[PDB]
Amino acid sequence: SLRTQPSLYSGPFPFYRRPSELGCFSLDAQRQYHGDARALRYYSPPPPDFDLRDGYPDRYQPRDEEVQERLDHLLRWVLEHRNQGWLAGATVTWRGHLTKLLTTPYERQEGWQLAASRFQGTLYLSEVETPAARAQRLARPPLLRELMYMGYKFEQYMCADKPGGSPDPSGEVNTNVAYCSVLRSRLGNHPLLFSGEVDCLNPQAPCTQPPSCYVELKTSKEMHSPGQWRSFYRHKLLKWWAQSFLPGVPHVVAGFRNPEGFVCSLKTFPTMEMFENVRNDREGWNPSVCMNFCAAFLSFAQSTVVQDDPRLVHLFSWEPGGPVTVSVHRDAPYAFLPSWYVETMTQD
Ligand SMILES: [Mg+2]
């Protein structure tokens, strides 16, 4: 087991390598994979009065969340690019999985599970939906469903499909569509290969080379008091920082929503400056604690997963308050590396 309290992980900010984009892939409106950037949209801010409720629900095509894709689309990319043993000493995951590790020392509400499998040296990490999270997903109240749509809608007001184009929110929001950047990094002694969904690219960004040219878009409720801002800095900026820090996305652009579902204000939060909001806060978060924990977890997983075997899973389970605990599983349902990937890699 691995303890999770922040005090264990205070100390110097560890080494995190400047991320390089190795490539990308797109999922289209039918969730079919394409090894190019067709799904990538372009940051096109107002020059805001955005109705995030517009099109809900008649122009809404939500992804079927029952389909658990796990690492499948990343593994296709890896398979088609394993000529770009560095991989053997790496850990392969989704950006979002690493985000959840980053936020663990401070997370008090949502637990997680991560399946680990070692296969020809490489450590693969793939999130498992917990029974409790599966319960909440199926029991999603109308208001949660509207809120989620609103987050996706915001993007349609802020992005165009061509550089410098005008946003066109008259169409449908279809959440099968995704653009994913594939990045290489390293946290201390742990080489990383991961994909992350990317909201848009800013043509007028100072550095036009990805991932620096990318922008993350967010919505949050409007705030009218120091206390509301302080809770926002403490809870939501931590999540936003941990999401955008990893892939090297330098800006998060937030639209603040009315209780009536309109965005009438925008604010840019540079990733590099987010921690400043809580640096002198007795109940704030700390990016060095986030990264030190993550590095500790990677070391823990790497020493725990001894056997090289794609049918074997070490399930890392964590609930708020407690340590990360481990259980050992084989085959269904936890085994996540598909035959089509294992055989092709074995073929080499
Ligand atoms: Mg976003």
Side-chain angles (χ1 to χ4, degrees), residues 63 65-72 74-75 91-101 103-104 107 110-117 123-134 136-137 140 195 197 297 313-319 333-337:
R63 188 181 66 91
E65 286 172 70
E66 279 305 321
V67 189
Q68 305 276 129
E69 304 170 333
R70 299 181 285 190
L71 305 188
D72 289 359
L74 177 53
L75 303 175
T91 304
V92 179
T93 344
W94 282 97
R95 185 269 309 283
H97 299 5
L98 297 167
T99 299
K100 291 191 178 202
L101 297 172
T103 66
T104 299
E107 175 66 40
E110 287 181 24
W112 52 253
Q113 288 189 316
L114 297 166
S117 294
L123 182 72
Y124 294 90
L125 302 178
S126 183
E127 189 179 20
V128 170
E129 190 176 46
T130 69
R134 189 198 163 77
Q136 282 160 7
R137 177 168 51 81
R140 272 181 202 154
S195 41
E197 303 182 331
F297 175 86
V313 169
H314 288 74
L315 187 62
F316 298 84
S317 292
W318 179 82
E319 284 300 325
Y334 295 121
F336 58 89
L337 302 163

Short mmCIF file of all heavy atoms in Angstrom, two decimals, residues 63 65-72 74-75 91-101 103-104 107 110-117 123-134 136-137 140 195 197 297 313-319 333-337:
data_model
loop_
_atom_site.label_atom_id
_atom_site.label_comp_id
_atom_site.label_asym_id
_atom_site.label_seq_id
_atom_site.Cartn_x
_atom_site.Cartn_y
_atom_site.Cartn_z
N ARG A 63 -21.83 10.88 -26.46
CA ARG A 63 -21.12 9.62 -26.56
C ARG A 63 -21.77 8.57 -25.66
O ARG A 63 -22.24 8.88 -24.57
CB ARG A 63 -19.66 9.83 -26.16
CG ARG A 63 -18.74 8.63 -26.40
CD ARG A 63 -17.33 8.93 -25.94
NE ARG A 63 -17.22 9.13 -24.50
CZ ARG A 63 -16.95 8.15 -23.63
NH1 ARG A 63 -16.79 6.91 -24.04
NH2 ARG A 63 -16.86 8.43 -22.34
N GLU A 65 -21.33 6.26 -23.08
CA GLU A 65 -20.32 6.02 -22.05
C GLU A 65 -20.23 4.57 -21.55
O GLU A 65 -19.32 4.24 -20.78
CB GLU A 65 -20.53 6.98 -20.86
CG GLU A 65 -20.11 8.41 -21.16
CD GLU A 65 -20.47 9.38 -20.06
OE1 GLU A 65 -19.87 9.31 -18.96
OE2 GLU A 65 -21.36 10.24 -20.29
N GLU A 66 -21.15 3.72 -21.98
CA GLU A 66 -21.09 2.31 -21.63
C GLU A 66 -19.91 1.61 -22.31
O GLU A 66 -19.30 0.72 -21.73
CB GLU A 66 -22.41 1.59 -21.93
CG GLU A 66 -23.48 1.79 -20.87
CD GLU A 66 -23.03 1.41 -19.44
OE1 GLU A 66 -22.31 0.41 -19.25
OE2 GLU A 66 -23.42 2.13 -18.50
N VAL A 67 -19.59 2.04 -23.53
CA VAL A 67 -18.44 1.51 -24.26
C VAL A 67 -17.18 1.94 -23.52
O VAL A 67 -16.89 3.13 -23.44
CB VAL A 67 -18.38 2.04 -25.72
CG1 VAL A 67 -17.31 1.29 -26.51
CG2 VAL A 67 -19.73 1.91 -26.41
N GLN A 68 -16.46 0.98 -22.96
CA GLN A 68 -15.22 1.32 -22.24
C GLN A 68 -14.01 1.10 -23.14
O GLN A 68 -13.53 -0.02 -23.31
CB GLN A 68 -15.12 0.55 -20.92
CG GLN A 68 -16.34 0.74 -20.00
CD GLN A 68 -16.27 1.99 -19.15
OE1 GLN A 68 -17.21 2.80 -19.12
NE2 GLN A 68 -15.15 2.17 -18.43
N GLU A 69 -13.53 2.19 -23.72
CA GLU A 69 -12.48 2.13 -24.72
C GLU A 69 -11.12 1.89 -24.12
O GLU A 69 -10.21 1.44 -24.81
CB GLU A 69 -12.47 3.41 -25.56
CG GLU A 69 -13.80 3.69 -26.20
CD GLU A 69 -13.87 5.04 -26.82
OE1 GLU A 69 -13.14 5.95 -26.37
OE2 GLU A 69 -14.66 5.19 -27.77
N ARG A 70 -10.99 2.20 -22.83
CA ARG A 70 -9.74 2.05 -22.08
C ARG A 70 -8.59 2.68 -22.88
O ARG A 70 -8.70 3.83 -23.29
CB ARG A 70 -9.51 0.58 -21.68
CG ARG A 70 -10.64 0.06 -20.78
CD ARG A 70 -10.47 -1.36 -20.34
NE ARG A 70 -10.75 -2.31 -21.41
CZ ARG A 70 -10.86 -3.63 -21.22
NH1 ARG A 70 -10.71 -4.15 -20.02
NH2 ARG A 70 -11.12 -4.41 -22.26
N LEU A 71 -7.51 1.93 -23.12
CA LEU A 71 -6.37 2.49 -23.84
C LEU A 71 -6.41 2.25 -25.35
O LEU A 71 -5.47 2.62 -26.04
CB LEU A 71 -5.04 1.95 -23.29
CG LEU A 71 -4.70 2.10 -21.80
CD1 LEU A 71 -3.26 1.67 -21.57
CD2 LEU A 71 -4.91 3.52 -21.29
N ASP A 72 -7.49 1.67 -25.86
CA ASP A 72 -7.49 1.12 -27.23
C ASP A 72 -7.02 2.06 -28.35
O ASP A 72 -6.26 1.63 -29.24
CB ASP A 72 -8.85 0.51 -27.56
CG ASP A 72 -9.11 -0.79 -26.81
OD1 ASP A 72 -8.25 -1.26 -26.02
OD2 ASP A 72 -10.20 -1.35 -27.02
N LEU A 74 -5.17 4.93 -28.06
CA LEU A 74 -3.75 5.20 -27.84
C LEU A 74 -2.87 4.05 -28.34
O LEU A 74 -1.85 4.27 -28.99
CB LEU A 74 -3.47 5.47 -26.35
CG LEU A 74 -2.02 5.71 -25.92
CD1 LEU A 74 -1.34 6.81 -26.73
CD2 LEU A 74 -1.94 6.02 -24.43
N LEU A 75 -3.25 2.82 -28.00
CA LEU A 75 -2.50 1.62 -28.42
C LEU A 75 -2.43 1.45 -29.95
O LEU A 75 -1.42 0.98 -30.49
CB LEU A 75 -3.07 0.35 -27.76
CG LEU A 75 -3.11 0.31 -26.23
CD1 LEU A 75 -3.80 -0.96 -25.76
CD2 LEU A 75 -1.72 0.43 -25.60
N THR A 91 6.08 4.37 -19.12
CA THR A 91 4.73 4.14 -18.66
C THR A 91 3.78 4.79 -19.66
O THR A 91 3.98 5.94 -20.05
CB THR A 91 4.48 4.75 -17.27
OG1 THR A 91 5.45 4.25 -16.34
CG2 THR A 91 3.08 4.40 -16.75
N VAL A 92 2.77 4.04 -20.08
CA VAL A 92 1.84 4.49 -21.11
C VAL A 92 0.45 4.59 -20.48
O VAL A 92 -0.03 3.61 -19.89
CB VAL A 92 1.82 3.51 -22.34
CG1 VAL A 92 0.84 3.96 -23.39
CG2 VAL A 92 3.20 3.37 -22.95
N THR A 93 -0.17 5.77 -20.58
CA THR A 93 -1.49 6.06 -19.99
C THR A 93 -2.20 7.19 -20.74
O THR A 93 -1.66 7.74 -21.69
CB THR A 93 -1.38 6.61 -18.55
OG1 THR A 93 -0.09 6.36 -17.99
CG2 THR A 93 -2.45 6.04 -17.68
N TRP A 94 -3.40 7.55 -20.26
CA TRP A 94 -4.06 8.81 -20.64
C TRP A 94 -3.59 9.92 -19.71
O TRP A 94 -3.35 9.69 -18.52
CB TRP A 94 -5.59 8.68 -20.53
CG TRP A 94 -6.18 7.95 -21.68
CD1 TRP A 94 -6.51 6.63 -21.74
CD2 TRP A 94 -6.48 8.50 -22.97
NE1 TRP A 94 -7.01 6.32 -22.99
CE2 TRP A 94 -7.01 7.46 -23.76
CE3 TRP A 94 -6.38 9.79 -23.52
CZ2 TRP A 94 -7.42 7.65 -25.09
CZ3 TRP A 94 -6.78 9.98 -24.84
CH2 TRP A 94 -7.30 8.91 -25.61
N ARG A 95 -3.49 11.13 -20.25
CA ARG A 95 -3.26 12.33 -19.44
C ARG A 95 -4.17 12.37 -18.21
O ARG A 95 -3.70 12.65 -17.10
CB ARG A 95 -3.47 13.58 -20.29
CG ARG A 95 -3.16 14.92 -19.58
CD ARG A 95 -4.38 15.53 -18.89
NE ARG A 95 -5.54 15.61 -19.78
CZ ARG A 95 -5.71 16.52 -20.74
NH1 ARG A 95 -4.81 17.48 -20.95
NH2 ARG A 95 -6.80 16.48 -21.49
N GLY A 96 -5.47 12.12 -18.41
CA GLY A 96 -6.47 12.21 -17.33
C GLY A 96 -6.18 11.30 -16.15
O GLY A 96 -6.47 11.65 -15.00
N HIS A 97 -5.60 10.14 -16.44
CA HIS A 97 -5.20 9.19 -15.41
C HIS A 97 -4.13 9.82 -14.52
O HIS A 97 -4.25 9.80 -13.29
CB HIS A 97 -4.73 7.89 -16.05
CG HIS A 97 -5.77 7.20 -16.87
ND1 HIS A 97 -7.02 7.73 -17.11
CD2 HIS A 97 -5.75 6.01 -17.52
CE1 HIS A 97 -7.72 6.91 -17.87
NE2 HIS A 97 -6.97 5.85 -18.12
N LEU A 98 -3.11 10.42 -15.14
CA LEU A 98 -2.07 11.15 -14.42
C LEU A 98 -2.61 12.34 -13.63
O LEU A 98 -2.10 12.64 -12.55
CB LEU A 98 -0.92 11.57 -15.36
CG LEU A 98 -0.10 10.46 -16.06
CD1 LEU A 98 0.75 11.03 -17.16
CD2 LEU A 98 0.76 9.65 -15.07
N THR A 99 -3.63 13.00 -14.17
CA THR A 99 -4.28 14.11 -13.46
C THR A 99 -4.83 13.61 -12.11
O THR A 99 -4.63 14.27 -11.08
CB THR A 99 -5.42 14.74 -14.30
OG1 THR A 99 -4.89 15.27 -15.52
CG2 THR A 99 -6.10 15.87 -13.55
N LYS A 100 -5.50 12.46 -12.12
CA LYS A 100 -6.09 11.89 -10.91
C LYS A 100 -5.06 11.53 -9.86
O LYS A 100 -5.35 11.61 -8.67
CB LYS A 100 -6.99 10.70 -11.23
CG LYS A 100 -8.25 11.11 -11.95
CD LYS A 100 -9.26 9.99 -12.04
CE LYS A 100 -10.52 10.49 -12.74
NZ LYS A 100 -11.69 9.64 -12.39
N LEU A 101 -3.87 11.13 -10.30
CA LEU A 101 -2.76 10.89 -9.39
C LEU A 101 -2.30 12.21 -8.80
O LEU A 101 -2.21 12.36 -7.58
CB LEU A 101 -1.61 10.18 -10.13
CG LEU A 101 -1.91 8.78 -10.67
CD1 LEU A 101 -0.76 8.26 -11.54
CD2 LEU A 101 -2.20 7.83 -9.52
N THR A 103 -3.88 14.91 -8.27
CA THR A 103 -4.81 15.54 -7.34
C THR A 103 -5.09 14.71 -6.08
O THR A 103 -5.67 15.23 -5.11
CB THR A 103 -6.11 16.00 -8.04
OG1 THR A 103 -6.86 14.87 -8.51
CG2 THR A 103 -5.80 16.95 -9.20
N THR A 104 -4.63 13.45 -6.07
CA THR A 104 -4.92 12.50 -4.99
C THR A 104 -4.65 13.04 -3.56
O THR A 104 -5.54 12.98 -2.71
CB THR A 104 -4.25 11.11 -5.22
OG1 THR A 104 -4.74 10.52 -6.43
CG2 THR A 104 -4.56 10.16 -4.10
N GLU A 107 -7.62 15.28 -2.81
CA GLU A 107 -8.96 14.90 -3.26
C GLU A 107 -9.79 14.31 -2.12
O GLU A 107 -9.38 13.33 -1.50
CB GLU A 107 -8.86 13.93 -4.43
CG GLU A 107 -10.20 13.37 -4.91
CD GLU A 107 -11.10 14.43 -5.52
OE1 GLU A 107 -10.60 15.33 -6.24
OE2 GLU A 107 -12.32 14.35 -5.27
N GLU A 110 -14.00 12.16 -4.82
CA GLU A 110 -14.04 11.09 -5.84
C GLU A 110 -12.84 10.13 -5.72
O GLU A 110 -11.70 10.55 -5.91
CB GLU A 110 -14.04 11.69 -7.26
CG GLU A 110 -15.33 12.35 -7.72
CD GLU A 110 -15.25 12.90 -9.15
OE1 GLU A 110 -14.41 12.42 -9.96
OE2 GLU A 110 -16.02 13.83 -9.48
N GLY A 111 -13.11 8.86 -5.45
CA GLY A 111 -12.07 7.83 -5.44
C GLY A 111 -11.75 7.35 -6.85
O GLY A 111 -12.37 7.80 -7.82
N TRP A 112 -10.77 6.45 -6.96
CA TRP A 112 -10.42 5.87 -8.27
C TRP A 112 -9.84 4.46 -8.19
O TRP A 112 -9.51 3.97 -7.10
CB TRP A 112 -9.49 6.79 -9.08
CG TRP A 112 -8.24 7.28 -8.37
CD1 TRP A 112 -8.01 8.54 -7.89
CD2 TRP A 112 -7.04 6.52 -8.08
NE1 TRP A 112 -6.76 8.62 -7.33
CE2 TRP A 112 -6.14 7.40 -7.43
CE3 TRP A 112 -6.64 5.20 -8.31
CZ2 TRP A 112 -4.87 6.99 -7.00
CZ3 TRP A 112 -5.37 4.80 -7.88
CH2 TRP A 112 -4.51 5.70 -7.24
N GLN A 113 -9.73 3.83 -9.36
CA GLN A 113 -9.05 2.55 -9.54
C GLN A 113 -8.25 2.60 -10.83
O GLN A 113 -8.76 3.05 -11.86
CB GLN A 113 -10.04 1.40 -9.61
CG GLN A 113 -10.70 1.04 -8.30
CD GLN A 113 -11.51 -0.24 -8.39
OE1 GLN A 113 -12.24 -0.46 -9.36
NE2 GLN A 113 -11.38 -1.10 -7.38
N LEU A 114 -7.01 2.13 -10.78
CA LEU A 114 -6.17 2.04 -11.97
C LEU A 114 -5.63 0.63 -12.12
O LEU A 114 -5.00 0.11 -11.20
CB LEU A 114 -4.99 3.02 -11.90
CG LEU A 114 -5.26 4.52 -11.85
CD1 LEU A 114 -3.99 5.25 -11.43
CD2 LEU A 114 -5.80 5.03 -13.21
N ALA A 115 -5.90 0.03 -13.28
CA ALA A 115 -5.32 -1.26 -13.65
C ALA A 115 -3.92 -1.06 -14.22
O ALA A 115 -3.72 -0.23 -15.13
CB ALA A 115 -6.22 -1.95 -14.67
N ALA A 116 -2.96 -1.81 -13.69
CA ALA A 116 -1.60 -1.85 -14.21
C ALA A 116 -1.27 -3.22 -14.79
O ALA A 116 -1.56 -4.25 -14.19
CB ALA A 116 -0.61 -1.49 -13.13
N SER A 117 -0.66 -3.21 -15.98
CA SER A 117 -0.15 -4.42 -16.62
C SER A 117 1.20 -4.07 -17.25
O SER A 117 1.32 -3.07 -17.97
CB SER A 117 -1.10 -4.92 -17.72
OG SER A 117 -2.34 -5.38 -17.20
N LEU A 123 5.13 -0.28 -18.69
CA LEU A 123 4.03 -0.30 -17.74
C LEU A 123 2.85 0.46 -18.33
O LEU A 123 2.97 1.62 -18.73
CB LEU A 123 4.45 0.32 -16.40
CG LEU A 123 3.37 0.30 -15.31
CD1 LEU A 123 3.15 -1.12 -14.80
CD2 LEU A 123 3.71 1.26 -14.16
N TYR A 124 1.72 -0.23 -18.43
CA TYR A 124 0.50 0.38 -18.95
C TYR A 124 -0.48 0.60 -17.80
O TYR A 124 -0.67 -0.28 -16.98
CB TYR A 124 -0.12 -0.53 -20.01
CG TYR A 124 0.71 -0.70 -21.27
CD1 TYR A 124 1.66 -1.72 -21.38
CD2 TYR A 124 0.53 0.15 -22.36
CE1 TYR A 124 2.41 -1.89 -22.55
CE2 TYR A 124 1.28 0.00 -23.52
CZ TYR A 124 2.22 -1.02 -23.61
OH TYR A 124 2.95 -1.16 -24.76
N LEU A 125 -1.08 1.79 -17.75
CA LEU A 125 -2.04 2.13 -16.69
C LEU A 125 -3.37 2.54 -17.32
O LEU A 125 -3.41 3.41 -18.18
CB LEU A 125 -1.50 3.25 -15.81
CG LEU A 125 -0.18 3.12 -15.05
CD1 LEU A 125 0.10 4.42 -14.29
CD2 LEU A 125 -0.21 1.94 -14.10
N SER A 126 -4.44 1.92 -16.87
CA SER A 126 -5.74 2.10 -17.47
C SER A 126 -6.81 2.17 -16.39
O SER A 126 -6.97 1.23 -15.60
CB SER A 126 -6.02 0.97 -18.46
OG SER A 126 -7.26 1.15 -19.13
N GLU A 127 -7.54 3.29 -16.35
CA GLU A 127 -8.54 3.52 -15.31
C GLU A 127 -9.71 2.54 -15.37
O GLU A 127 -10.18 2.17 -16.45
CB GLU A 127 -9.07 4.97 -15.36
CG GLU A 127 -9.95 5.32 -14.15
CD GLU A 127 -10.48 6.73 -14.15
OE1 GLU A 127 -10.52 7.37 -15.23
OE2 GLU A 127 -10.87 7.19 -13.05
N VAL A 128 -10.16 2.13 -14.19
CA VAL A 128 -11.33 1.28 -14.05
C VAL A 128 -12.42 2.11 -13.38
O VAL A 128 -12.18 2.72 -12.34
CB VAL A 128 -11.02 -0.01 -13.24
CG1 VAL A 128 -12.31 -0.77 -12.87
CG2 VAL A 128 -10.07 -0.92 -14.01
N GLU A 129 -13.60 2.15 -13.99
CA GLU A 129 -14.74 2.83 -13.38
C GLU A 129 -15.15 2.05 -12.14
O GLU A 129 -15.39 0.84 -12.22
CB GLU A 129 -15.91 2.94 -14.35
CG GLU A 129 -17.03 3.85 -13.87
CD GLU A 129 -18.14 4.01 -14.90
OE1 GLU A 129 -18.58 3.00 -15.49
OE2 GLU A 129 -18.58 5.16 -15.12
N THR A 130 -15.20 2.72 -10.99
CA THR A 130 -15.58 2.05 -9.75
C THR A 130 -17.09 1.77 -9.77
O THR A 130 -17.84 2.52 -10.40
CB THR A 130 -15.21 2.89 -8.48
OG1 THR A 130 -16.02 4.06 -8.41
CG2 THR A 130 -13.73 3.29 -8.48
N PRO A 131 -17.53 0.68 -9.11
CA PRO A 131 -18.97 0.42 -8.97
C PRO A 131 -19.77 1.67 -8.56
O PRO A 131 -20.82 1.94 -9.15
CB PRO A 131 -19.03 -0.63 -7.86
CG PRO A 131 -17.76 -1.40 -8.03
CD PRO A 131 -16.72 -0.40 -8.49
N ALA A 132 -19.26 2.41 -7.58
CA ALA A 132 -19.91 3.63 -7.09
C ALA A 132 -20.01 4.73 -8.16
O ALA A 132 -21.05 5.39 -8.27
CB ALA A 132 -19.20 4.16 -5.85
N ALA A 133 -18.93 4.93 -8.92
CA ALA A 133 -18.93 5.86 -10.05
C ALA A 133 -19.86 5.37 -11.16
O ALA A 133 -20.55 6.18 -11.80
CB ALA A 133 -17.52 6.06 -10.58
N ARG A 134 -19.88 4.06 -11.40
CA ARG A 134 -20.81 3.48 -12.36
C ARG A 134 -22.26 3.76 -11.93
O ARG A 134 -23.11 4.03 -12.77
CB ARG A 134 -20.58 1.98 -12.54
CG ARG A 134 -21.39 1.39 -13.68
CD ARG A 134 -21.53 -0.12 -13.60
NE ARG A 134 -22.62 -0.60 -14.46
CZ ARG A 134 -22.55 -0.72 -15.79
NH1 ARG A 134 -21.44 -0.38 -16.44
NH2 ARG A 134 -23.60 -1.16 -16.46
N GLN A 136 -23.38 6.36 -10.03
CA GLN A 136 -23.64 7.79 -10.23
C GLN A 136 -23.88 8.13 -11.70
O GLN A 136 -24.78 8.92 -12.02
CB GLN A 136 -22.48 8.63 -9.66
CG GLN A 136 -22.51 8.78 -8.14
CD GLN A 136 -21.17 9.18 -7.52
OE1 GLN A 136 -20.20 9.47 -8.23
NE2 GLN A 136 -21.11 9.18 -6.19
N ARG A 137 -23.09 7.53 -12.60
CA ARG A 137 -23.25 7.77 -14.03
C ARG A 137 -24.65 7.40 -14.51
O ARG A 137 -25.29 8.17 -15.23
CB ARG A 137 -22.20 7.03 -14.86
CG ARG A 137 -22.40 7.21 -16.37
CD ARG A 137 -21.22 6.75 -17.21
NE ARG A 137 -20.78 5.39 -16.88
CZ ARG A 137 -21.37 4.28 -17.32
NH1 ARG A 137 -22.41 4.34 -18.13
NH2 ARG A 137 -20.89 3.09 -16.96
N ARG A 140 -27.46 9.78 -13.09
CA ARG A 140 -27.25 11.20 -13.37
C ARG A 140 -28.57 11.95 -13.49
O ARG A 140 -29.35 11.69 -14.40
CB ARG A 140 -26.45 11.40 -14.65
CG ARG A 140 -24.95 11.41 -14.45
CD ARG A 140 -24.27 11.65 -15.78
NE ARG A 140 -22.88 11.18 -15.77
CZ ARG A 140 -22.22 10.82 -16.86
NH1 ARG A 140 -22.81 10.86 -18.05
NH2 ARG A 140 -20.97 10.41 -16.77
N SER A 195 -1.59 10.19 -24.08
CA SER A 195 -2.45 11.00 -24.94
C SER A 195 -3.37 11.84 -24.06
O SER A 195 -3.65 11.48 -22.92
CB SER A 195 -3.27 10.13 -25.89
OG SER A 195 -3.75 8.97 -25.22
N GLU A 197 -6.96 14.57 -24.63
CA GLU A 197 -7.90 15.33 -25.47
C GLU A 197 -7.59 16.83 -25.40
O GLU A 197 -7.31 17.37 -24.32
CB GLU A 197 -9.37 14.99 -25.12
CG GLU A 197 -9.66 13.48 -25.25
CD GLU A 197 -11.10 13.06 -24.96
OE1 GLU A 197 -11.79 13.74 -24.16
OE2 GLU A 197 -11.54 12.03 -25.53
N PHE A 297 3.97 7.35 -6.69
CA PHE A 297 3.04 6.32 -7.17
C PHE A 297 3.65 5.50 -8.30
O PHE A 297 3.57 4.28 -8.31
CB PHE A 297 1.68 6.88 -7.61
CG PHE A 297 0.78 5.82 -8.20
CD1 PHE A 297 -0.03 5.05 -7.38
CD2 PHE A 297 0.78 5.57 -9.57
CE1 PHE A 297 -0.85 4.06 -7.91
CE2 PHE A 297 -0.03 4.57 -10.11
CZ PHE A 297 -0.85 3.82 -9.28
N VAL A 313 -3.23 -8.25 -14.07
CA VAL A 313 -3.50 -6.88 -13.65
C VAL A 313 -3.24 -6.68 -12.16
O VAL A 313 -3.71 -7.45 -11.32
CB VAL A 313 -4.97 -6.45 -13.97
CG1 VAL A 313 -5.31 -5.12 -13.29
CG2 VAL A 313 -5.18 -6.33 -15.48
N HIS A 314 -2.48 -5.63 -11.84
CA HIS A 314 -2.43 -5.13 -10.48
C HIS A 314 -3.34 -3.92 -10.43
O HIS A 314 -3.09 -2.91 -11.10
CB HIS A 314 -1.01 -4.80 -10.05
CG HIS A 314 -0.17 -6.02 -9.82
ND1 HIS A 314 0.32 -6.79 -10.86
CD2 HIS A 314 0.25 -6.61 -8.68
CE1 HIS A 314 1.02 -7.80 -10.36
NE2 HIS A 314 0.99 -7.71 -9.04
N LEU A 315 -4.44 -4.06 -9.69
CA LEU A 315 -5.45 -3.02 -9.54
C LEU A 315 -5.09 -2.16 -8.35
O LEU A 315 -5.03 -2.65 -7.22
CB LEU A 315 -6.84 -3.65 -9.34
CG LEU A 315 -8.08 -2.75 -9.33
CD1 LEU A 315 -8.27 -2.03 -10.66
CD2 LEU A 315 -9.34 -3.55 -8.98
N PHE A 316 -4.84 -0.88 -8.62
CA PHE A 316 -4.57 0.11 -7.57
C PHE A 316 -5.86 0.85 -7.27
O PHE A 316 -6.45 1.48 -8.14
CB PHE A 316 -3.46 1.07 -8.00
CG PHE A 316 -2.14 0.39 -8.24
CD1 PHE A 316 -1.85 -0.20 -9.47
CD2 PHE A 316 -1.18 0.33 -7.23
CE1 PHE A 316 -0.63 -0.85 -9.69
CE2 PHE A 316 0.04 -0.31 -7.45
CZ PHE A 316 0.31 -0.89 -8.68
N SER A 317 -6.32 0.72 -6.03
CA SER A 317 -7.58 1.29 -5.61
C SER A 317 -7.32 2.36 -4.58
O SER A 317 -6.49 2.19 -3.69
CB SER A 317 -8.50 0.22 -5.00
OG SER A 317 -8.94 -0.70 -5.98
N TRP A 318 -8.05 3.46 -4.70
CA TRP A 318 -7.91 4.54 -3.76
C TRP A 318 -9.26 5.20 -3.47
O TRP A 318 -10.05 5.45 -4.38
CB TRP A 318 -6.88 5.56 -4.24
CG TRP A 318 -6.75 6.71 -3.29
CD1 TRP A 318 -6.00 6.75 -2.15
CD2 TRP A 318 -7.41 7.97 -3.40
NE1 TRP A 318 -6.15 7.97 -1.54
CE2 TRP A 318 -7.02 8.74 -2.28
CE3 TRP A 318 -8.31 8.52 -4.32
CZ2 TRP A 318 -7.48 10.04 -2.07
CZ3 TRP A 318 -8.77 9.81 -4.11
CH2 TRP A 318 -8.35 10.55 -2.99
N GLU A 319 -9.50 5.44 -2.18
CA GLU A 319 -10.65 6.19 -1.72
C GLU A 319 -10.15 7.35 -0.84
O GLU A 319 -9.16 7.18 -0.13
CB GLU A 319 -11.62 5.29 -0.92
CG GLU A 319 -12.47 4.35 -1.77
CD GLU A 319 -13.38 5.07 -2.77
OE1 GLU A 319 -13.87 6.17 -2.45
OE2 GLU A 319 -13.61 4.53 -3.88
N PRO A 333 -12.58 -9.27 -15.67
CA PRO A 333 -12.89 -8.14 -16.55
C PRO A 333 -11.74 -7.10 -16.66
O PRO A 333 -11.80 -6.23 -17.51
CB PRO A 333 -14.09 -7.51 -15.85
CG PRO A 333 -13.80 -7.73 -14.38
CD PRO A 333 -12.94 -8.97 -14.27
N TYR A 334 -10.73 -7.22 -15.80
CA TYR A 334 -9.73 -6.14 -15.65
C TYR A 334 -8.65 -6.10 -16.72
O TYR A 334 -8.18 -5.02 -17.07
CB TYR A 334 -9.11 -6.14 -14.25
CG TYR A 334 -10.08 -5.83 -13.12
CD1 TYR A 334 -10.29 -6.75 -12.08
CD2 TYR A 334 -10.77 -4.62 -13.06
CE1 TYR A 334 -11.17 -6.48 -11.03
CE2 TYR A 334 -11.65 -4.34 -12.02
CZ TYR A 334 -11.84 -5.27 -11.01
OH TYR A 334 -12.72 -4.98 -9.97
N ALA A 335 -8.24 -7.26 -17.24
CA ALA A 335 -7.26 -7.31 -18.33
C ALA A 335 -7.70 -6.37 -19.44
O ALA A 335 -8.80 -6.50 -19.97
CB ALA A 335 -7.12 -8.73 -18.86
N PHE A 336 -6.83 -5.43 -19.80
CA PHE A 336 -7.21 -4.38 -20.75
C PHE A 336 -6.42 -4.34 -22.06
O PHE A 336 -6.86 -3.70 -23.01
CB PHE A 336 -7.19 -2.99 -20.09
CG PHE A 336 -5.87 -2.62 -19.48
CD1 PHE A 336 -4.91 -1.97 -20.24
CD2 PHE A 336 -5.60 -2.90 -18.15
CE1 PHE A 336 -3.68 -1.61 -19.69
CE2 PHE A 336 -4.37 -2.55 -17.60
CZ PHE A 336 -3.41 -1.90 -18.37
N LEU A 337 -5.28 -5.01 -22.12
CA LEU A 337 -4.47 -5.00 -23.35
C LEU A 337 -5.04 -6.02 -24.35
O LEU A 337 -5.02 -7.22 -24.08
CB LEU A 337 -2.99 -5.28 -23.08
CG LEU A 337 -2.20 -4.38 -22.12
CD1 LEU A 337 -0.91 -5.08 -21.69
CD2 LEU A 337 -1.88 -3.01 -22.72
#
